[PDB]
Amino acid sequence: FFWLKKAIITARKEQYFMPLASVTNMPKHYGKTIKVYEYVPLLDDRNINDQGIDASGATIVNGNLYGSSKDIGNITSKLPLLTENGGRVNRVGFTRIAREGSIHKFGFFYEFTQESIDFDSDDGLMEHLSRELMNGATQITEAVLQKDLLAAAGTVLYAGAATSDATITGEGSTPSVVSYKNLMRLDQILTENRTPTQTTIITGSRMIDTKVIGATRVMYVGSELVPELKAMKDLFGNKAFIETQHYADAGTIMNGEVGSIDKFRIIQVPEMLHWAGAGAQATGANPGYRTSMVSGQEHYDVYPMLVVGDDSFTSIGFQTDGKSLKFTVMTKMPGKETADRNDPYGETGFSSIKWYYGILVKRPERLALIKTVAPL
Amino acid sequence: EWNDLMRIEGKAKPPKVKGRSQVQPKLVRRQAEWRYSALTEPFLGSNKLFK
Amino acid sequence: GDINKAMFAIVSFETCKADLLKEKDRYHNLNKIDWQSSAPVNEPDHATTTP
Secondary structure, three states, X not given: OOOOOOOOOOOOOOOOHHHHOEEEEOOOOOOOEEEEEEEOOOOOOOOOOOOEEOOXXXXXXXXXXXXXXXXXXXXXXXXXXOOOOOOOOOOXXXXXXXXXXXXXXEEEEEEEEHHHHHHOOOOOHHHHHHHHHHHHHHHHHHHHHXXXXXXXXXXXXXXXXXXXXXXXXXXXXXXXXXXXXXXXXXXXXXXXXOOOOOOOOEOOOOOOOOOOEOOOEEXXXXXXXXXXXXXXXXXXXXXXXEEHHHHOOOOOOOOOEEEEEOOEEEEEOOOOOOOOOOOOEOOOOOOOEOEEEXXXXXXXXXXXXXXXXXXXXXXXXXXXXXXXXXXXXXXXXXXXXXXXXXXXXXXXXXXXXXXXXXXXXXXXXXXXXXXXXXXX | OHHHHHHOOHHHOOOXXXXXXXXXXXXXXXXXXXXXHHHHHHHHOOOOOOO | OOXXXXXXXXXXXXXXXXXXXXXXOOOOOXXXXXXXXXXXXXXXXXXXXXX
């Protein structure tokens, strides 16, 4: 038999969350912590101070005129009014808040032998090993960032009628699947929190059979939820999902986009992470939703669906040359350099990689998330 | 691989045994050593380089 | 087998901010890169004699 002298290799896995993150420069000789101030407006409820005098000259508990309350009676009760011979009547107070983040360390290494280096039939083995090492490092770092983002969400909307992760179940009267009304509510919440948009509406083209789409935000889903999204129907019973070929004209298709529903442009991320066993126990009445085995009991699987806003978070950069993350690689080939003091044979070697990673969440209200089950 | 053959590293290195030698003469280095100065000299003969 | 028929060529070199700023107009987007830093050159793809 005759070896082909060529190898079969699988490329990297493309990364979606890492490119979004912005980088904040942190000089050394300071520590492992970064902090910022945040000045709250005058009228928000967060303005808890002790500098209040009402219109009658008497001290009052709250220093903000009226909170984030739209009630007309409350506003009329707490309006600032001034008489003609006015003096020392209305006082206001201010407040600032601080936030922080920290840097953590990572790393891994591998070993090999000189006889394996030489006598091996394949030539260029160590190049392959370096390639897989680097790919593994990149994939791990992306997974860590995605995990931290999912853990640090600020706006959470459970689907169906659930309240916590243990309650999200796909069996019974009301299964916990994503619905059109849930997406409408998520849009409403983001609009109320003043989150800026990302894209713009797509008007029509002149070519036959081309629908008009007005989504304005970007949403990341897993691979498992795509059939569920495709099967969704809107309020009037028609189809909801609009595929990309309809509006590819008169618009720009983003990377890894599957379609548009309501006001979100769905994006499929291959390396999306899901919880395992978070849901309630699954009996034999399963309609066909994915489950998992935890402690011998079949529990449902709770799935993500995430809408990262703008300026929500930044990535601390420690000696990264203004990048999100930079790796450090070392190699020592066998020889006298690796001739151990108790073993001058020197038949082995190694290669190691390490980095520093940390994240600062400036505003956690902009991050949004939906938890659902995913069909099998 | 060619550089390792020239400088005697990697696969070209002799095996190590406690009771025996590890001497390898350098044929490739020798043959290259005369060729370098054979080829170099014509470019340095005259004061001017380009005609 | 002919360099003239090549569609593209890619070269990696080491430069400092002085070289880039020697011609301001040529380069855009020079910001968004940290300079007040101190890191090993690294870049395993790049091969160089710099320690």
